[PDB]
Design an enzyme around this catalytic site. Structure first.
Site, PDB file in Angstrom:
ATOM      1  N   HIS A 127     -54.921  33.468  13.527  1.00  0.00           N
ATOM      2  CA  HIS A 127     -55.566  33.755  12.251  1.00  0.00           C
ATOM      3  C   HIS A 127     -56.780  34.661  12.504  1.00  0.00           C
ATOM      4  O   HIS A 127     -57.534  34.446  13.457  1.00  0.00           O
ATOM      5  CB  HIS A 127     -56.026  32.464  11.591  1.00  0.00           C
TER       6      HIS A 127
ATOM      7  N   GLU B  69     -59.766  35.171  11.782  1.00  0.00           N
ATOM      8  CA  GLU B  69     -61.110  34.649  11.990  1.00  0.00           C
ATOM      9  C   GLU B  69     -61.242  34.316  13.471  1.00  0.00           C
ATOM     10  O   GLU B  69     -62.211  34.693  14.121  1.00  0.00           O
ATOM     11  CB  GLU B  69     -61.352  33.405  11.130  1.00  0.00           C
TER      12      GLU B  69
ATOM     13  N   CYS C 225     -59.106  29.348   6.458  1.00  0.00           N
ATOM     14  CA  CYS C 225     -58.414  28.055   6.419  1.00  0.00           C
ATOM     15  C   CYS C 225     -59.232  26.981   7.131  1.00  0.00           C
ATOM     16  O   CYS C 225     -60.030  27.287   8.010  1.00  0.00           O
ATOM     17  CB  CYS C 225     -57.027  28.161   7.052  1.00  0.00           C
TER      18      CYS C 225
ATOM     19  N   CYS D  47     -59.509  27.389  10.885  1.00  0.00           N
ATOM     20  CA  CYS D  47     -60.319  28.611  10.992  1.00  0.00           C
ATOM     21  C   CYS D  47     -61.740  28.389  10.504  1.00  0.00           C
ATOM     22  O   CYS D  47     -62.690  28.825  11.134  1.00  0.00           O
ATOM     23  CB  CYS D  47     -59.684  29.744  10.211  1.00  0.00           C
TER      24      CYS D  47
HETATM   25 ZN   LIG Z   1     -56.823  29.834   9.464  1.00  0.00          ZN
END
Ligand SMILES: [Zn+2]
Length: 539
Positions: A417, A419, A448, A451
């Protein structure tokens, strides 16, 4: 701001009283009096004061600084007579040229030069290849051949660039941020040569400005690479020295960075024409530049007539020689990214904590422009209903301090992801916990919970860092809102992208081919809608 009256801002270290005498000659022959001022942090003050339609009529500073001034539109365009243009050196007019037009008048020239000890060295070397051979000679008399400020790029760059290293290729009245010559075979040649010099301990690789200055001034080292700023010290050191052309690597001259003291006209000034009259007919003359030079040295100057006379001094002649061999300091903002990306690379190539090509490729790509695709941006950043369909988050980032910059964008790779990628990107990037940095995000989706969790931890672990996040949409799949509440209590400023933010992104991270931003239908409505939802979540 006055009218019928000039106000001039010059730095305290440059001879102002001479300029005021020039201003007095102007007042004498004209009746328009001029006031010469030397305020504190005027390179900072002027950008603020000018935006209000205030400040001086004329500003004197290094040409590099005038780029951001030109971009903010604080400097008037000048169109001096092609006949007057000739009075000065052609290459000096390229330093005052921003986005294909002249924003300033060239005045003076600084550049690096080879300073050698006349006693130890009667005849300095014309090549970099002689330096080891000559080093092992003086090593036997308890002396070192060459020592300089190895820790920082400005000083190390000339050797690197000699075989064709460059910062940004100067197209024609313009640099393109997309192309960078940092990882070029010639930069690798020069840099590897430097690494060989520090491998044999011809110089320690720990050396700094103060160490090299102490070394040379106390008679330890025969040669140092440095600037007019440092001449006076060595004069009072009683050392017999000389200033000359930098040595040639692979037969090609070394390229310092030419700085150019320039006078620029405030765009807010009604006295533009008065200023031009004064600068051309009074300041930029043998008489005016001489009167200024008496108060404090200008080194080499842009005016050919006075520069032939100052060239009677071989030191100044050497400065000018190296300048013409060198390359104009780029005035564009991505230079911030250049320094910081090179500075750390050479160091890691110096200690040997990575290899030459690794460090130079890292630096090459770190200071270089990758701009999105327009359609990709348009497709990924739409905040609407039914935009739950789009899969992979995008993240545009800016690393600030405001002082320095780095721009870019990231997308979802295999796993990871965005991030987490960013954290991995910045983590590789060292940081001084003494210094403070300010990071800004523009994201498709929100973070998320995982994340979110990790980023909050990272922020806690690095309390020097401050983060703000502008997001188009909020992601879910109980969980994510809390995640955002962590980030809330972690001190992250989370916001939803308004029109101004879309404009910013469109003009910053995207390659638009100079096209304006077209608002798609229902942008504001969804923006305030998601804003209501967000404010509902955080409170
Ligand atoms: Zn995430």
């Amino acid at each position: 701001i006055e009218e019928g009256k000039l106000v001039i801002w010059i730095n305290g270290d440059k001879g102002y009283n001479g300029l005021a005498e020039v201003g007095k000659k102007f007042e004498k022959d004209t009746g328009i009096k001029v006031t010469v001022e030397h305020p504190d942090k005027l390179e900072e003050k002027f950008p603020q004061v000018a935006a209000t339609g205030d400040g001086p009529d004329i500003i004197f500073w290094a040409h590099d600084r005038f780029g951001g001034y030109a971009q903010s539109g604080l400097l008037a365009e000048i169109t001096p007579a092609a006949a007057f243009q000739d009075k000065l050196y052609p290459f000096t007019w390229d330093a005052v040229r921003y986005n294909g037009k002249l924003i300033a008048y060239p005045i003076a020239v600084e550049a690096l030069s080879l300073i050698y000890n006349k006693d130890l060295l009667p005849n300095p070397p014309k090549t970099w290849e002689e330096i080891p051979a000559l080093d092992k000679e003086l090593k036997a008399k308890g002396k070192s051949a060459l020592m300089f400020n190895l820790q920082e790029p400005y000083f190390t760059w000339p050797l690197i660039a000699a075989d064709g290293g460059y910062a940004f290729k100067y197209a024609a009245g313009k640099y393109d941020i997309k192309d960078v010559g940092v990882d070029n075979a010639g930069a690798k040649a020069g840099l590897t040569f430097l690494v060989d010099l520090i491998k044999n301990k011809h110089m320690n690789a720990d050396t700094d400005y103060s160490i090299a200055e102490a070394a040379f001034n106390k008679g330890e080292t025969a040669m140092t690479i440095n600037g007019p700023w440092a001449w006076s010290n060595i004069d009072t050191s009683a050392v017999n020295y000389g200033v000359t052309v930098l040595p040639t690597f692979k037969g090609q001259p070394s390229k310092p960075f030419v700085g150019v003291l320039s006078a620029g006209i405030n765009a807010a000034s009604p006295n533009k024409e008065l200023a031009k009259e004064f600068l051309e007919n009074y300041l930029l003359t043998d008489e005016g530049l001489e009167a200024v030079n008496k108060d404090k040295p200008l080194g080499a100057v842009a005016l050919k007539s006075y520069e032939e006379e100052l060239a009677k001094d071989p030191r100044i002649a050497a400065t000018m020689e190296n300048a013409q061999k060198g390359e104009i300091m780029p005035n564009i903002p991505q230079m911030s990214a250049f320094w910081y990306a090179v500075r750390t690379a050479v160091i890691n190539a110096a200690s040997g904590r990575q290899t030459v090509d690794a460090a130079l490729a890292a630096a090459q790509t770190n200071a270089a422009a990758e701009f999105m695709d327009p359609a990709t941006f348009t497709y990924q950043f739409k905040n609407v209903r039914w935009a739950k369909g789009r899969r992979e988050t995008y993240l545009c980032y800016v690393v600030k301090r405001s002082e320095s910059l780095d721009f870019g964008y990231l997308r979802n790779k295999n796993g990871c992801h965005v991030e987490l990628l960013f954290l991995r990107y910045i983590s590789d990037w060292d940081l001084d916990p003494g210094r403070c940095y300010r990071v800004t995000w523009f994201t498709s989706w929100s973070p998320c919970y995982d994340c979110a969790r990790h980023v909050a931890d990272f922020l806690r672990g690095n309390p020097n860092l401050s983060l703000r996040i502008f997001t188009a949409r909020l992601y879910f799949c109980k969980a994510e809102p809390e995640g955002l509440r962590r980030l809330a209590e972690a001190g992250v400023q989370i916001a939803i992208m308004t029109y101004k933010d879309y404009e910013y992104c469109w003009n910053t991270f995207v390659e638009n081919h100079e096209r304006t931003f077209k608002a798609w239908e229902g942008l504001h409505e969804n923006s305030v809608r998601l804003s209501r939802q967000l404010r509902r979540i955080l409170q």
